[PDB]
Amino acid sequence: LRPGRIDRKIEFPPPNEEARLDILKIHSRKMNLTRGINLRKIAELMPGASG
Amino acid sequence: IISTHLAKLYDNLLEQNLIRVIEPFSRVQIEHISSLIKLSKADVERKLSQMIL
C-alpha cells in the first residue's frame, strides 16, 4: 500500500437485496433452469446471505 | 387408492396370465387361449397384438 504502488482501496459491505439477487443470477446463469423460475422469490426467501 | 391401482394390477395380471397360458405351445389357437383365460376372443387378440408390438 506504499505510494508508488497499489495504494487506492475500495471497500465492500455485505450485499444488499439487489446485489444478492444479481449474484444469484450470475451464478445460476450456466444451469438448466425450468420455466417461471423466480430467483427473486428465492433471494427473498434467502435473507442475509453472502456470496 | 386401491381402486385407483386396480386397473393397472388387472392389466399386469392379464399379461402374465397370457404368457403362462401360451408358454407350452407353438401354434396355439386364439380361440383356445380365450377359452383358457375366460376372456373374449377380440380382447385376447388385441392384447396379444399389443404384447407383440
Binding site: 446485489a19 439477487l21 444479481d22 450470475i26 446463469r29 | -
Partner: protein, 51 residues
C-alpha cells in the same frame, strides 16, 4: 556441447566414472500462466452486476 546452451536450471547427464556433462536432456517447462486469460470477459457487465 557449447556452454551457451548450458543455461541455469536445465537438466543434464553426467558420465559415470568422471562427471562430465555430455547431454542436455529435455526439460519440463510447466507453464502455469497461460491458463487464466478470460479474453474480453464477455457477459460480465455493470448492468447485470447491478447493485
Amino acid at each position: 556441447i557449447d556452454i551457451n546452451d548450458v543455461t541455469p536450471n536445465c537438466r543434464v547427464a553426467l558420465r559415470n566414472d568422471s562427471y562430465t556433462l555430455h547431454k542436455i536432456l529435455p526439460n519440463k517447462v510447466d507453464p502455469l500462466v497461460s491458463l487464466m486469460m478470460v479474453e474480453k470477459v464477455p457477459d460480465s457487465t455493470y448492468e447485470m452486476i447491478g447493485g
